[PDB]
Amino acid sequence: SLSCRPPMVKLVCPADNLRAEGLECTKTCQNYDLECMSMGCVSGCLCPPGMVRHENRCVALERCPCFHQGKEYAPGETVKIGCNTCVCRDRKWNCTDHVCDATCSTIGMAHYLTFDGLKYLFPGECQYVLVQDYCGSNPGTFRILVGNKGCSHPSVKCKKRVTILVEGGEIELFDGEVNVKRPMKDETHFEVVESGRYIILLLGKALSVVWDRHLSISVVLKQTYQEKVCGLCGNFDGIQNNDLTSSNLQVEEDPVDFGNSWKVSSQCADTRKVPLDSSPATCHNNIMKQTMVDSSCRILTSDVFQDCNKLVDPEPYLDVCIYDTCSCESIGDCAAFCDTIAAYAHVCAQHGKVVTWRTATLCPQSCEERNLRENGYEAEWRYNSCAPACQVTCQHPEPLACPVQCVEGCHAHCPPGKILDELLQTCVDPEDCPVCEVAGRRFASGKKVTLNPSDPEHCQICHCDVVNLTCEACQEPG
Ligand SMILES: *[C@@H]1O[C@H](CO)[C@@H](O)[C@H](O)[C@H]1NC(C)=O
Ligand SMILES: *[C@@H]1O[C@H](CO)[C@@H](O)[C@H](O)[C@H]1NC(C)=O
Ligand SMILES: *[C@@H]1O[C@H](CO)[C@@H](O)[C@H](O)[C@H]1NC(C)=O
Ligand SMILES: [Ca+2]
Ligand SMILES: [Ca+2]
């Protein structure tokens, strides 16, 4: 019987003893909080009770590493998921609980998906506060309103109007175009980016809107606005179960009650409650169509979406897909079907799981129509499931802090060393853009850049005629 290296102690297995546990019940950094059942003990040397065997030596239990998705991380080695960091300390994952940047989203005709993940139905026909920071003791910087007309009982034909009020300006989203009714007092960080199917609005450093030009309206807030906003999109605090809090700080169990409390004009009437129809318009008493709609919308958890289903819950997009498609006479050309599915694929792509799902049979989209090679336009337009959203063009010469990584649609491809000119729909040399530069910032002709906004002695508003740059001092408002 040769001695064992400390602190391991030997275990002679007695055959004449009823039960015994040897090396078969060895405890490592993996199987510690588990139980063992030995057919017969294996004689050998094992670590003392307080320790576990790890890498052929006895280690303290607290010195055990943590495991994340199979990979081993030493104690102290942090992993970052989202905007939170998880430190490995004492064989445990200690994670921060910070609220990350969030997105409010209108899904489909009459559903809303709040910043904190609450999905509810609210078929209001008036104008409502989508998101605003005028809540109680308010700084009061921005207010975004949404008006729904035709998204009620007949949802086949519906149109929405979004009104954006920020920094003294009013930007309205309606009928697939952006209308800047009143400019922001400082346009330096204001951009209207048309990319693919979408229009991306930069409304300052921390407020953005992503819009598919029809009914998918998203507000992207940075986490500095947490607990500071209210309206149909909730209070943005990481707690989903309190987003149905009305304007009078009371939790409402019915979404129709919560939504009516955010009605803007007292002229129109509040929405009255209706019992939830599990089979709306064309699915009512039609088990055949309910099966067709369920099978079509079930693409959201099919193969191409399986990777994304782990990162982004498809349940709310699937509920909305089924509810809205039940208003279409045909699922092939159904607009509510493709838009809702595309809205999910868009969120997937923001999490690094770009999903190519369209086909010529199902929701086809091609760029062949606007590929005018033989017409004097030098630009090739190719569809991409997710291409960089904020590309440098003559109209956006400085690189932008884009609220989304990429978007779906048609994107122009230019020869090496050439930049897209959006107004001319053709590729041009970067020197040929009507673009000025000041303070290291390039801005397009007609854009106004404000230098030192808060400094009355150095505030300047710079204008770009074509390539001509002129700056003027600001006027003290008195
Ligand atoms: C994580 O660290 C904090 C201190 O930052 C401590 O209060 C908390 O108990 C730790 N949690 C775990 C599970 O180690
Ligand atoms: C889309 O663009 C990416 C780069 O942004 C490229 O790698 C990919 O091959 C493109 N796919 C299609 C179908 O154009
Ligand atoms: C630029 O503007 C100045 C006056 O501000 C004018 O004298 C000059 O001719 C302009 N140059 C061009 C190229 O337009
Ligand atoms: Ca909340
Ligand atoms: Ca620069």
Among 77, 96, 75, which Cα is nearest to 85's? 96
Phi, psi dihedrals of residue 206, rounded to the nearest 5°: -120, 5
Residue found under tokens 């229009």: 199
Judge contact between 303 and 286, C-beta under 8 A: no
Q: Is 354 exposed, middle or buried (0-12, 13-18, 19+ CB in 10 A)?
A: buried
Concatenate the DSSP letters of all residues of 420-462 into one string: EETTTTEEE-GGGS-EEEETTEEEETT-EEEESTT-TTT-EEE
Dist CA 368 CA 382 (whole Å): 8
Q: Quick check: helix, strand or coil at residue 290?
A: helix
Residue found under tokens 């982004």: 312
Interstrand relation of 66-68 and 58-60 (parallel, antiparallel or unpaired)? unpaired
Experiment used for this model: X-ray
**How remote is the CA of residue 286 from the centroid of ligand 4, in Å?**
38
**How remote is the CA of residue 468 from the centroid of ligand 3, in Å?**
6
Give CA torsion, residues 448, 387, 339, 319, to 10 deg. -110
The CATH number given to whatever domain includes residue 405 is: 2.10.25.10
DSSP state letter for 375: G
Dist CA 90 CA 61 (whole Å): 8
Q: Quick check: helix, strand or coil at residue 62?
A: helix
Structure tokens, 112: 């809303």
User: CA angle, corner 315, sides to 313 and 321, nearest 5?
Assistant: 125
Judge contact between 124 and 181, C-beta under 8 A: no
Structure tokens, 349: 């792509």
**How remote is the CA of residue 455 from the centroid of ligand 5, in Å?**
22
Structure tokens, 198: 């979408």
- Pocket lined around ligand 2, Cβ cut-off 6 Å: 382, 384, 387
Dist CA 321 CA 119 (whole Å): 13
Structure tokens, 1: 């019987």
Range of the domain at 400: 368-432
Q: Is 191 exposed, middle or buried (0-12, 13-18, 19+ CB in 10 A)?
A: buried
Beta strands in 196-320, from DSSP E residues, in sequence order: 198-203, 207-211, 217-221
Interstrand relation of 159-166 and 169-174 (parallel, antiparallel or unpaired)? antiparallel
Nearest CA to ligand 1 atom 10: 94
Atom of ligand 2 nearest to the CA of 383: 14
Dist CA 191 CA 204 (whole Å): 9
Q: How many helices (H) and strands (E) does the chain have?
A: 5, 30
